[PDB]
């Protein structure tokens, strides 16, 4: 029988009912490495801790794919006013630290 | 002095409080339940039980015919049977061969054992709730006395006042329909006193135990006797109530949530756990002592030495104090992240105490104050090694009692980390469009 | 009995008298009787007068 810490009871022929309690023992390590801390919750919550995970590494995802959609077009940005006219001098700031591209010529 | 507050509804577990009347001492209270009954308003509707059909004597024309009329009685039958010829002891009874007659009336009331075992059918509709409350404070003893959960009433225990909450909830195990048979109660419909299927539960349906009249179908009908035997058979549907007997489930009190045990004799339900009972107590003016009369504590440090995760009491915390005088005062946690398990300490000039405190947090971060002031206390807790214990939980576990320290250092490098990522990529867009309008011109 | 489960025989008829349409009652939840005559009051609860 699975016992929560709401509590069971149980009567078994003609004796006395009987209650007990289930404690937060678990298995796992919360003061640890990222796998000791997931299996330590997963083992006390395995209905929370297994969507938070999933919800987690979407917002991740999103934001990642919203990022290079950001920086991306701003790289697109530094390269089009630069490589139409190939005789401007590029500047020692745009080659390396702002956008990716180097100088040439 | 009056002292307003909220306390759950749960039996075993003292609520304590510290009353805070101004230029006074502070006083410790706690308010312990031992009871809580609801007790929903019953009316009898009527009784079942298992029957006895009666057969009085045929009479036995020897030729002739002899007619019944209708009799007043539950289930009454009547049928003639013609042309018998029966045998008794000593020859045979009748002489006139082949033109006979037998009665042979059948009735059905009401058995012996219906005085002892029967089903007792009742609607139920709200009524009253009562508990009983203990009570102490200051050096008073304990007091206890039962009260009702009403707002309205007040019920003085020792020389205080107490006036017990409604309760937040209006739930009750019964339905609106129950049957009490015998030691145990079951929640059923009924046929309502006029019907009955002869076989199930209402073949036999009383108003009272000792009423006079009588419903009762059992689909009694007479059979012919045979080969000139004087008697009167028949046969009918065996019992309702016997066959309910066999094939009823479990009663309400296996069935009912919260762990409502059922009690019987005013029909209560006891010792349920649900919603919250409000509180207000009027304590004596008399037992607040002036605050001038007190000792004063000054320069608190606490640390915690063991705790754990347990439902009894598994921490241990030490503080070292200085005080001016020599005397007693109440200790106190206001936060819900610990209960104290002491309630006043002996104090001395410039000594240490120790106290025993239970928590579901991994780091407590509550606060306890101890002679009108306040110490913080910090610390950190293990996991217990037992699985299953045989107590209820002191504490309250809340919605942040699980995440540890490490726990939340991921929290935030997950949150921070990526929304300061979009935010690199918003200031990227904001910075590219300042260098192309500065191109324009 | 008006309700439209419990026969009566009238004679040699039976009649099942169906339940009302509507289940107006003109009492309130606390009523007070005095003598023959009854008031729609409420209740100081036996602790409060």
Redesign the interface.
Same mark, same amino acid.
């Given at each position: 029988f699975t016992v929560t810490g709401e509590g069971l009871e149980y009567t078994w022929g003609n004796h006395p009912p009987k209650r007990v309690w289930a404690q937060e023992s678990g298995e796992g390590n919360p003061h640890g490495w990222p796998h000791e801390v997931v299996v330590y919750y997963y083992n006390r919550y395995p209905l929370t801790t297994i969507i938070g995970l999933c919800t987690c590494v979407a917002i991740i995802m999103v934001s990642c794919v919203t990022s290079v959609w950001l920086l991306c077009r701003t790289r697109n940005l530094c390269i089009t006013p630069y490589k139409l006219a190939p005789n401007a001098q590029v500047p020692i700031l745009l080659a390396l630290l702002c956008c990716i591209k180097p100088t040439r010529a | 002095y009056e002292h307003t507050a909220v306390m759950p509804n749960k039996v075993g577990i003292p609520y304590k409080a510290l009353v805070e009347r101004p230029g006074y001492a502070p006083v410790h209270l706690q308010i312990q339940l031992v009871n809580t009954r609801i007790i929903p308003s019953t009316n009898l509707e009527y009784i079942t039980c298992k029957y006895k059909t009666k057969v009085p004597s045929p009479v036995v024309k020897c030729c002739g015919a002899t007619q019944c009329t209708s009799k007043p009685h539950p289930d009454y039958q009547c049928q003639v049977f013609s042309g018998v010829y029966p045998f008794m002891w000593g020859g045979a009874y009748c002489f006139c061969d082949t033109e006979n007659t037998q009665m042979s009336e059948a009735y059905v009331e009401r058995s012996e054992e219906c005085s002892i075992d029967h089903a007792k059918a009742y609607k139920v509709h709200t009524g009253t709730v009562q508990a009983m409350v203990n009570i102490t404070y200051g050096s008073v003893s304990w007091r206890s006395a039962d009260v *009702?959960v009403?707002g309205? #009433?007040?019920?003085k225990i020792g020389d205080a006042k107490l006036i017990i909450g409604p309760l937040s909830s209006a739930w009750s195990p019964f339905d609106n329909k129950v049957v009490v048979y015998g030691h145990e109660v079951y929640n059923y419909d009924f046929?309502? *006193?006029?019907?009955g299927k002869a076989g199930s539960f209402g073949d036999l349906q009383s108003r009272t135990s000792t009423s006079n009249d009588l419903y009762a179908n059992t689909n009694l009908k007479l059979q012919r006797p045979q080969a000139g035997i004087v008697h009167t058979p028949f046969t009918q549907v065996p019992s309702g109530f016997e066959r309910w007997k066999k094939d009823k489930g479990a009663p309400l009190n296996?069935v009912a949530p919260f762990?409502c045990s059922i009690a019987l004799e005013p029909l209560r339900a006891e010792n349920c756990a649900v919603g919250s009972i409000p509180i207000s107590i009027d304590i004596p003016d008399a037992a607040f002592t002036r605050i001038s009369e007190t000792p004063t504590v000054s320069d608190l440090e606490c640390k915690i030495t063991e705790c754990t995760?347990?439902?009894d009491f598994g921490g241990i915390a030490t503080v070292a104090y200085k005080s001016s005088k020599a005397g007693n005062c109440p200790i106190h946690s206001p936060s819900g992240v610990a209960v104290i398990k002491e309630n006043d300490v002996t104090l001395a000039e410039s000594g240490s105490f120790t106290f025993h405190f239970s928590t579901?947090n991994?780091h407590p971060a509550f606060k306890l104050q101890v002679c009108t002031s306040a110490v913080t206390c910090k610390g950190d807790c293990k996991?217990?090694?037992?699985?299953?214990?045989?107590?209820?939980?002191q504490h309250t576990?809340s919605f942040t009692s699980?995440i540890?320290?490490?726990?939340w250092s991921?929290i935030k490098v997950?949150v921070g980390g990526?929304?300061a990522?979009?935010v690199?990529?918003?200031i990227? #867009?904001a910075?590219?469009a300042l260098?192309?309008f500065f191109?324009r011109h």
């Open positions: - | *009702y009403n309205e #009433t007040p019920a046929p309502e *006193y006029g019907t296996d762990g995760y347990a439902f579901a991994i996991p217990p090694k037992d699985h299953i214990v045989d107590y209820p939980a576990e699980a540890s320290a490490t726990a991921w997950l990526t929304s990522f979009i690199l990529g918003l990227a #867009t910075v590219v260098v192309l191109h």
